[PDB]
Amino acid sequence: ALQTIINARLPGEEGLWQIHLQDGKISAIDAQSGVMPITENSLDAEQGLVIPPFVEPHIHLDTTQTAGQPNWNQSGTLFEGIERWAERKALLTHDDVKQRAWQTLKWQIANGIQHVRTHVDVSDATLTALKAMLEVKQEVAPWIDLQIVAFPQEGILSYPNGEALLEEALRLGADVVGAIPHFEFTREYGVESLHKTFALAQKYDRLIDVHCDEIDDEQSRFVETVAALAHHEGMGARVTASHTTAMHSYNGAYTSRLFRLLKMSGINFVANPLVNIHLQGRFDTYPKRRGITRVKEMLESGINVCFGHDGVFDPWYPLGTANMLQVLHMGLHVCQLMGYGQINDGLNLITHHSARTLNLQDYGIAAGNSANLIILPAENGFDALRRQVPVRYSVRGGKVIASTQPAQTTVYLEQPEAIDYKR
Amino acid sequence: ALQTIINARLPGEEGLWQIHLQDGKISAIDAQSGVMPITENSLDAEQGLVIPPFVEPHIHLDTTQTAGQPNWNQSGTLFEGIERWAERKALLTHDDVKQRAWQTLKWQIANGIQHVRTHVDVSDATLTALKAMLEVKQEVAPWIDLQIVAFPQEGILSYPNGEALLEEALRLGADVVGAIPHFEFTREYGVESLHKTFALAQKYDRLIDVHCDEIDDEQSRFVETVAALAHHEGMGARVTASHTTAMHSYNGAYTSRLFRLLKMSGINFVANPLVNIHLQGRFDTYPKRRGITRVKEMLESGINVCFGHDGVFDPWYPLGTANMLQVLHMGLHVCQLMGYGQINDGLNLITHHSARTLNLQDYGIAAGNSANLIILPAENGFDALRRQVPVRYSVRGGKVIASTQPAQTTVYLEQPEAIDYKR
Ligand SMILES: [Fe+3]
Ligand SMILES: [Fe+3]
Ligand SMILES: [Mg+2]
Ligand SMILES: [Mg+2]
């Protein structure tokens, strides 16, 4: 079994490092003064970057892989997506959900993602997708720690037996309580739904992840209730507000007042760049707003924010290969986090910040932690992002669970020349 | 030498096709009723997509590869970019320009780009970068047909001897006359600069490519003069308006009136998604506009529009690997061209539409044309875009000038499994 990871670069650290492994855990981390020779039981990072696993804090594995079945969304609109999904009703079965979820999960494993939080629609009396996902969670456990959010897609108070179904999902094992206040019939139902969500989270000792203010409505401010209730219960770490795209449209004065509460509350924020740029701003003509939450300001204020892919190859987001560096690339551009350091530190948005969002207790390259880490064939975060590098090796429990042999490009000039896109 | 390309898929066509080659040209194109066997002198597209070469209609090879030299742009702003570039003055020499231009050109060759239009700053009495680029043009000719735009970066009327230098650049061989009306001191200088630009283009029989209205100013309407002068001279095909980001902020009534002229004029438009999303909207707080020109509406109106990378690894755009599918990916998202067909037809924005913009006379998979084509290991444009596939083979004059052996990804579950990110 692997005993050491050598010649590793670490974000924010100078030089090369050696990571000693023992019994599936990291036993020690020592600096090197030069390049170490490879040997049996040693995985050579070859001066590449070693980081804890990529994390997917927000994805919908119950709808993934269905784009084009039976028809494609030609307009690319949310409205048509709903219609196209409805046309696939007959195919939505236990086995179908498991098959599609597993397909995307395999892409995630290949992409060095070892932690995934999937929302699952529980506005379904049969709870078909949930029962399927609970089995998938057990099956994929050796490679990915999957969290399931009981997501009341049609509302808690605005859907028949919505609250009862949400609680049933928790009784069946869902890890996180979801909500969607801006989709409830009224602002009052929205606020009330959050009180019910928090009550359930405290009753069952579960995390919370709200689809919060995902709308270009400057009056959608459910985020303040999410943060206030978290602060009141002293449970910020266990709470997440997903999307908050409405924040992109708030006036600056309210946002400034709100930020004090956001920081004090300690709650987490998830932005989903690929989907947000696609679905937001659809009611604008020109100019058209970007519609992503205030990521840059959150980072400047020390508020934990991270990036999710949200949808993969489905009616609402037709693209994706479940690649976090791709999600990061889009987020850095749309959020204008384009300074060298901002780009280089970008990896935090798809690693450490996301681990905090999932309230992970065993994450990071540190002595005592499980030997879960990935190797990127790049010098630093900037380089990894610029070249959209694959994951050379993914290690879990001290064992390699995925590897990618990089593409080899050659140009035939007066003589053949290898091209690696580095200067 | 290669005599045939077999098992090729073609955009907009059903089935597989065989492309016969002779004397460096395409002699015939025949449909296949099934898969053909490989053989000596046959390049197997393996049911991948075959298209004419990718095109880079707008890049600055004189500034490429300088990011971080001597210091990095930490804010990521245009302002700091100017300062960082100024700090590298001592390194700007003939050989330096040639070295950096060639580095990016090699990345472009590796990425199946056989046609490139580079702007070169001619607001320099020594015309250092231009003299260097003219040599590069000759040197890279076997692999890339390079067009040079004499770009008066500091203005024609607003810079000492600006007009004389612009004309000198044409007398030295620049292929295209550039301008930048919104950067001139006054609106009047802006309009006058365009009359001078058109007069020079007609005097020397050159193309025109104006950095046009690249500013979030709803009053920057130099595009109407570019189109009107083109229509008056009956030279629309030879004219291009780059950027036109101001159009993102125009009221709809003026835009509707303007579009009639744009269509009648026949001029070309270049949008630069990666840079536009980064540099535009910088004076907005929240909400923040996207700042890309009206690509979707242009396509719906039959106005030729295409995508350029603009900057690669420089003070103003720190990222990039000169990859057109990456540029396309950003453009489809920001312009909300996310319907299945819109994404699939996206390849036109980086192939045929760009060829028209460069006024290319030998481009396309058609009998009689030079055997210049590339092979993508994908089923169609949608698939190529979604998976960000590399160029498997680039063929020029019937000879392979670049090839990429795809990355190989494996996940180790109960058994090893190859992952290709296809469902
Ligand atoms: Fe979601
Ligand atoms: Fe430019
Ligand atoms: Mg959603
Ligand atoms: Mg520019």
UniProtKB/Swiss-Prot annotation, chains A, B:
Binding-site residues, Zn(2+): H58, H60, H211, D310
Gene Ontology MF terms: cytosine deaminase activity; ferrous iron binding; identical protein binding; isoguanine deaminase activity; zinc ion binding
Activity's dependence on pH: Activity is lost under pH 5 but not affected up to pH 10.
Role: Catalyzes the hydrolytic deamination of cytosine to uracil. Is involved in the pyrimidine salvage pathway, which allows the cell to utilize cytosine for pyrimidine nucleotide synthesis. Is also able to catalyze deamination of isoguanine, a mutagenic oxidation product of adenine in DNA, and of isocytosine. To a lesser extent, also catalyzes the conversion of 5-fluorocytosine (5FC) to 5-fluorouracil (5FU); this activity allows the formation of a cytotoxic chemotherapeutic agent from a non-cytotoxic precursor.
Keywords: Cytosine metabolism, Hydrolase, Iron, Metal-binding, Zinc
Stored InterPro entries: Amidohydro_3 (IPR013108), Metal-dep_hydrolase_composite (IPR011059), Metal_Hydrolase (IPR032466), Metallo-hydrolase_Enzymes (IPR052349)
EC nos: 3.5.4.1, 3.5.4.-
Broad EC category: hydrolase
A Pfam entry, by short name: Amidohydro_3
Example of a GO biological process term: cytosine catabolic process
Regulation: Fe(2+)-CDase is rapidly inactivated by H(2)O(2), whereas Mn(2+)-CDase, Co(2+)-CDase, and Zn(2+)-CDase are not inactivated by H(2)O(2). CDase is also inhibited by excess divalent cations. Phosphonocytosine, a mimic of the tetrahedral reaction intermediate, inhibits the deamination of cytosine with a Ki of 52 nM.
Use in biotech settings: Cytosine deaminase is being explored for use as a suicide gene for cancer gene therapy. The cytosine deaminase/5-fluorouracil combined therapy has been used successfully for a variety of animal tumor models and is currently under investigation for the treatment of human cancers.
Protein name: Cytosine deaminase
Binding site for Fe(2+): H58, H60, H211, D310
Catalytic center residues: E214
Site residues (Activates the nucleophilic water), renumbered to this chain: H243
Gene3D superfamilies xref list: Metal-dependent hydrolases, Urease, subunit C, domain 1
Disrupted-gene phenotype: Cells lacking this gene have less than 1% of the isoguanine deaminase activity of the wild-type strain.
Record annotation: effect of changing H243Q: 200-fold decrease in catalytic efficiency
Coiled-coil spans in chain: none
Subunit comment: Homohexamer.
Impact after mutating D310A: Less than 0.01% of wild-type enzymatic activity
GO annotation, cellular component aspect: cytosol
